[PDB]
Design a protein around this ligand. Structure first.
Ligand code: DHE
Ligand code: DHE
Ligand code: HEC
Ligand code: HEC
Lengths: 559, 559
């Protein structure tokens, strides 16, 4: 019955992070005709409903309504349910999106009826975005021959932090030692991720609207040297990291259209576009909207590592020959999202989040090695945290959005075979709603945020575990609670702390204290050796600070 | 100007061979709603129009109307053209289909209006056909363990011919020495191709409706031992031919849905389904309906060789690991259709027919090595004809649908380097409308049909060139004309002669004398040594005989 929406359409700590296609939602669409038994919506009503659908519903159900974490809502199925059921179900609203910018999920009576009617109509597919469109958007501001041949500024590039100023469509380049904002650059769109070329010279940023900017850190005044648009909705980018292939290529992954694009690493020239439309790995059924999620780069072969979410495929894409394109399509687990390489950089460990699994790929052999349930609800590692557990040996850790657990997986088949690819321990941190876990080789500490927790004090704090004290005896390791938001001294709202990131030396860890666009935010720097406050970064330009990426740690995959 | 249809839609010798989706056309479809400013069709009217569209138009314009050899006809474009233009254009009649069974391309006034209105409406995509559907259709009539362990009939299987009795959905198994019709087997819908497992035991047939049958030639009375449906429209099938992989797998290619399927070679169990939806190689634009055309099997690697037509991609699919699937996606040329391996079995030579090109792939190295224009219009080689030209060395030949030319390409990069992958000679045969060229290592003759020629004297005859008399002087080699239809002694609506196929020893070559379903047909056997009539096969059961496949020559790729 319609009351089942209380369990499936209310906000959880782990259902607020599905895609919001708010860039694609800005496109106007044509209202379709309605077959017998169905009523048409006017152009305005249909567009109003489409905008709501794309911003709030398509993340879980698809723009094409063929299903993602939520089931299919195609007209054959919804017409069988009928308007009355749909109206009653949708009256409850839908899950809230991310804090500070996402939807509340609340709908007016008029909006409820629009949505029920929209679901009974036949949707069109949004426009494709191919090579002609990419080349039209492709601009080389500074040709390679006109760029410097050596660093022409006096900055400490490897210790720089590239910080997303989300809602301002900017990034800040901040000195990792002095905390000086060296520059604020316009991207003109909200940036999701910063990634660095393997040499550390080129900074790549991708916006949620599919725009890519490439910045030359050697210029006297670093700026965008090239830009291109690669889709309508995108969230991932990466650079080539195989020895001998430094600075050769960049790759971007899109949600819409479902595709990835390999670009020249010096100019952003679009070289190869690959659709990710295809069959689910398990049921082997066609899926028309398999979004690209995280993208990593192999250190063992000249390949990109591409997660294809809805089909549960991990792609190893060999960039040595883009005409005779060699790929390995690895059947994994559905709902792949984020992940990272182990400490040796050989094995890719990724969360198939809605199925509570970690998938492990051997990037040297090009094959699946393991799939293990974490025992927690909805793992969300980011790139995760590699460390040497005093008892277990090399491990990789993840925290979870759906519960307070931290899980450890053994990552050393050669030296610790009995622990390899097994979940070795699971223990609580601050609370549900964690997004990022972090450590560094020079630190003895494991930091765990709780960004999406509904309790303000918890979402403004970070748990810190002492790795040296871990025994793996089955007890719950104690943790210190750092009052990060309190240290930032922000009076307004309930700012959420998110994502630890270390400096190059691994002696200081930064957190974003993230408030909304019209509120006060900060970055907080923690002294890793003492766990004491080192510095609070505030500036009128520091608007909605979210992701932070140290140049050295990002170029080298040190996590 | 709608009068452009006089040229655009004129029937030619080389535009009669685009797909007719007459199995998919049998599905009943409901009418879509009509947006404002568009008149709706009733369910009956829409279904009538849809059937015509799928049978006569979708081959060139696509079932989704995104274009194939003909341009896109999506509603954005057709509504700009308008009903009047569409009605006027379609009144002129469209290109005829194949002889004997294809459309005339003529429409009544009522049908013209149905088509113009159908083109203004928004089409749905026909149903997908995935693993669940394949498994529901999968039937193993005789389990492997219950089949013979040795040949239990006294037939000379290597000399057997498997002959398509087109319209009836049957095949005739005919003795290569006595010419006796040993058995006529029913499969339902028209069989397109017969292929043999590498051991010669199993005969695989693929129906145009996507039905695959596997027949055990070791039975006392050979019959289907397993069947499965792999799509709604399909034309290709092949077996694994790498040494060590005999009888391991079979692969089928579909037009709708756009996919290929790898099946167990003993049971037909469906193992891996791959979508062919993706980007065109050159302009790199998404194409929603890239049909699978010819499929061959590598003799150098454990791979299948799959032509993807509308995107111009040749896929090398490694079947040693179906979970960690390695493929090479080779950028080729659009409109790939048929082709064959050279005499050494290393290079795949295939016609990108609408662009008059031969594409050459090195199956050992997994890369494109050449793309050459034949100088002719619309090459159509079948698997082609390999021979050692007395002065040029190893060559492969193709004839053309659009003109009377025969082109020779050098196939020996190590031994005749300057000649390799170059068109070495071009010369006339009987006339345009050729479909198949043939030779055999034990013959000195090269046979060329002219099936689609408009003149009965030509379409009922075959040209035969003496390879031993070929010089490197640039002149045109003479040919002998064999009056194959006259030899059959049939007076019906100009039966057309098609496709030479040799017996196992290469001493006799068979041709089909193809007449309509309610008319008399024949097979004509020619003595290759004397170029004289040997025997005529006539039988009331021999209805619409077309493709003929000798077991030995098919199993070994001897052509
Ligand atoms: C696919 C994907 C990646 C992996 C990128 C890669 O491999 O390069 C990722 C990584 C990330 C990372 C990577 C951290 C790392 O250390 O690798 C961060 C900081 C991040 C901050 C946010 N993400 Fe992210 N994020 C999405 C998708 C993704 N986010 C969404 O679909 C989602 C849920 C909603 C949306 O429509 O955008 C979303 C919302 C957010 C935020 O609201 C965050 C917190 C702030 C912000 O700026 O938008 N996402
Ligand atoms: C993709 C394809 C192949 C390669 C198969 C492989 O590699 O296993 C092929 C091969 C073939 C071959 C392979 C000959 C060989 O020696 O390999 C033959 C004999 C053949 C006889 C016909 N074909 Fe064929 N044929 C189509 C497609 C194809 N035909 C069509 O789309 C088309 C044009 C129309 C349709 O809707 O089916 C079509 C009409 C015909 C005929 O009308 C023919 C002459 C008779 C018949 O039985 O239908 N096709
Ligand atoms: C992810 C967090 C969701 C968002 C955002 C929205 N929906 Fe959803 N929906 C989701 C689930 C988990 C379920 C239950 C079925 C399942 O997949 O497990 C649903 C169910 C519906 C239904 C009912 C369908 C049925 O067959 O009973 C409808 C009509 C529906 N959802 C619509 C819908 C709309 C309009 C949304 C935006 C306002 C929306 N959903 C958001 C998960 C998620
Ligand atoms: C292949 C042999 C064709 C078949 C079968 C049919 N059409 Fe076609 N069509 C074809 C060509 C080569 C062209 C010219 C444009 C190009 O792609 O080069 C066309 C054109 C049309 C048009 C005109 C569209 C315009 O923008 O002017 C229409 C409306 C059209 N064709 C419709 C159509 C229908 C209804 C058919 C079945 C009866 C049909 N075509 C068959 C090639 C081929």
């Amino acid at each position: 019955d319609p009351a089942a929406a209380l369990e499936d359409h209310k906000t959880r700590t782990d259902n607020r992070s599905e895609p919001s296609l708010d860039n694609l939602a800005q496109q106007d669409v044509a209202a379709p005709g309605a077959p017998e038994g169905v009523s048409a919506l006017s152009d305005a009503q249909y567009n109003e409903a489409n905008k709501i659908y794309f911003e709030r519903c398509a993340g879980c159900h698809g723009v094409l309504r063929k299903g993602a974490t939520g089931k299919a809502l195609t007209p054959d199925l919804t017409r069988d349910l009928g308007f009355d059921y749909l109206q009653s179900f949708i009256t409850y609203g839908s899950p809230a999106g991310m804090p500070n910018w996402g939807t509340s999920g609340e709908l007016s009576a008029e909006q409820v009826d629009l949505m029920a009617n929209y679901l009974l109509l036949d949707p069109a597919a949004p426009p494709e975005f191919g090579m002609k469109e990419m080349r039209e958007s492709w601009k080389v501001h500074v040709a390679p021959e006109d760029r410097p041949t050596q660093q022409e500024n006096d900055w400490d590039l490897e210790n720089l932090f590239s910080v997303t100023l989300r809602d301002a469509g900017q990034i800040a380049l901040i000195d990792g030692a002095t905390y000086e904002i060296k520059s604020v650059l316009d991207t003109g769109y909200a940036v999701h991720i910063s990634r660095l070329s393997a040499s550390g010279r080129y900074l790549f940023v991708i916006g949620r609207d599919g725009k890519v900017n490439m910045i030359d850190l050697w210029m006297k005044e670093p700026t965008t040297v090239a830009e291109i648009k690669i889709g309508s909705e995108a969230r991932s980018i990466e650079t080539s990291k195989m020895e001998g292939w430094e600075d050769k290529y960049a790759i971007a992954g899109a949600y819409w259209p479902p595709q990835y694009v390999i670009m020249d690493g010096e100019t952003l020239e679009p070289k190869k576009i690959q659709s990710t439309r295809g069959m689910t790995y398990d049921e082997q059924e066609y899926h028309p909207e398999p979004r690209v999620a995280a993208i990593l780069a192999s250190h063992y072969r000249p390949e990109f590592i591409v997660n294809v979410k809805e089909t549960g495929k991990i792609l190893l894409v060999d960039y040595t020959d883009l005409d005779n394109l060699k790929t390995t399509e690895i059947s994994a687990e559905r709902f792949l999202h984020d992940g990272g390489l182990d400490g040796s950089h050989r094995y890719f460990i990724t969360a198939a989040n809605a199925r509570n699994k970690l998938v492990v790929i051997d990037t040297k052999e090009g094959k699946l090695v393991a799939i293990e349930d974490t025992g927690g609800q909805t793992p969300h590692p980011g790139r995760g945290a590699n460390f040497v557990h005093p008892t277990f040996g090399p491990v990789w850790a993840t925290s979870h959005m759906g519960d307070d657990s931290v899980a450890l997986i053994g990552t050393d088949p050669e030296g610790h075979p009995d622990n390899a690819w097994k979940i070795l321990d699971s223990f609580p941190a601050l609370g549900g709603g964690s997004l990022f876990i972090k450590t560094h080789p020079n630190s003895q500490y494991l930091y765990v945020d709780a960004t999406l927790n509904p309790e303000a004090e918890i979402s403004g704090s970070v748990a810190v575990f002492d790795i040296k004290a871990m025994t793996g005896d089955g007890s719950d390791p104690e943790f210190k609670t750092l009052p990060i938001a309190e240290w930032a001294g922000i009076t307004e709202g309930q700012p959420r702390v998110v994502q630890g990131e270390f400096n190059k030396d691994g002696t200081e860890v930064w957190f974003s204290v993230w408030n909304g666009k019209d509120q006060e935010s900060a970055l907080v720097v923690v002294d890793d050796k003492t766990l004491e406050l080192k510095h609070v970064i505030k500036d009128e330009r520091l608007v909605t600070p979210t992701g932070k990426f140290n140049v050295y740690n990002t170029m080298t995959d040190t996590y």
